[PDB]
C-alpha cells in the first residue's frame, strides 16, 4: 500500500511558521477545499506528504524532484500531518485522540526568548498522553542572528529536560528559504519511524465524518471517513458500527448498533482493497445513505461484529484538572467540578455533553446526552462553558 503510515501532529502556535512549515512539507501552495474534510467534533485535519530521497545527492525531500540538485527522487514513505484550528482545538485533539498521533513536530520560534504560554501547554499535553516520538523545529532562524539563536537553543534544552521531549532533535529551519528542511525530513524518518503494528488485532476505526455521496438531486451506499487506530480493514469485510442509529422508545431516545459491509476503501488518494492506520480512510458501505447523510455517524466507532468496545450511557471518570497558563487572570484558577454542571466531553472522535450526577475522590459521575463507544481506561477531554465559550479544564479516565 502507498497510503500514509504515520500521523504527525504539527504542534505549534497558530503562526510561528506552522502553516508555512506544514505547506513547505506538503508542497501545497495553491489557496484548499480540504477544509471541507476537517473534523467537526475534534477539528482534526489531514495533509499527506510523500517522503522521498535523492539517489544522486542522497538528500531527503517531499518532492518528486530533488530541490538541491534537480534529479528524480525515489519513494520512501507516505505520511500525514495533522493539525487543528487554534490552541484550544489542538489541545482538545491531543487529549481526546492521542491514538490518532504517532509522533509530533513541536514548533518553537527562535524569534522569541522564553517558551510561550501555549508552547508550555503543548508540551504539557504531549507529556500527559505519553507521546515521545518528538522533533523540535526551531523555526524563523532567518530572522535572528547567530547569537540569539544559540541562546534560544539553550532555553529549549532546559525546557525539555525531564519531559517526553528530552531526547528530541532541535532543528534550526527556515521554512521561508527552505534551509534545513532536508534535515527535518530525514529527522521524520529517524525519529518518527512507522510503528510495528500487529495487523491481525481486532480492527477499530474512529469515524470523523459520514456522507451521502450519491450525485446531487449507480447509487452507492453510505460513506464513512475516519482513522483506523488498530488492525486493518478490507473490501468485503462485515463491520458493526456503535453506538449506531437512534430511535425512540417509550418517549426516550436509544441507539441500535448496525452492521453493514465494506464495498470500497479509499486512502492516499486512491481506491485500495485494504487500508491501515495512517491518514484519512474513506469507507464505502452498503448502508442506506439516509443513515450516513449529514455526518449522522461522526463520532461512531467501527469494528468487526462482536469485537467492538462497549457503549456507555454514563461514565465514572478519574479526573485530572489541568494547571493551565493560557487564559485571563482567574481563568487559570480551575474551580472544582460540582454536581449538576453540564460539561463538554470529547473521547476519540465522539463529542457529547455530560451532566455531573455524582462526585467521588478525584472522580465524577456524568450522565451523557449521547452514548459513546469507548474502552475502560480511555482518556476523555473535559471542557467547561465559561462566559459563553468552551474551555478545556482537564481530562478524565474512564473507570469501570
Ligand atoms: Zn539531489
From Swiss-Prot:
Residues 83-86 are annotated as: G3. Its EC number is 3.6.5.3. Residues 139-142 are annotated as: G4. GO terms for cellular component: cytosol. CDD domains: eIF2_gamma (cd01888), eIF2_gamma_II (cd03688), eIF2_gamma_III (cd15490). Residues 12-19 are annotated as: G1. Pfam families: eIF2_C, GTP_EFTU, GTP_EFTU_D2. Mg(2+) 1 binds at residues 19, 41. One of its GO terms (molecular function) is GTP binding. PROSITE patterns: G_TR_2 (PS51722). Mg(2+) 2 binds at residues 15, 39. Its cofactor is Mg(2+). InterPro entries: EFTu-like_2, eIF2G, eIF2g_C, eIF2g_dom_2, eIF2g_GTP-bd, P-loop_NTPase, Small_GTP-bd, T_Tr_GTP-bd_dom. It catalyses: GTP + H2O = GDP + phosphate + H(+). Residues 3-196 form the tr-type G domain. The keyword Nucleotide-binding applies. Residues 39-43 are annotated as: G2. Zn(2+) binds at residues 54, 57, 66, 69. Keywords: GTP-binding, Hydrolase, Initiation factor, Magnesium, Metal-binding, Nucleotide-binding, Protein biosynthesis, Zinc. GO terms for biological process: formation of translation preinitiation complex. Residues 174-176 are annotated as: G5. Heterotrimer composed of an alpha, a beta and a gamma chain. eIF-2 functions in the early steps of protein synthesis by forming a ternary complex with GTP and initiator tRNA. Belongs to the TRAFAC class translation factor GTPase superfamily. Classic translation factor GTPase family. EIF2G subfamily. NCBIfam families: eif2g_arch, PRK04000.1, small_GTP. This is Translation initiation factor 2 subunit gamma.
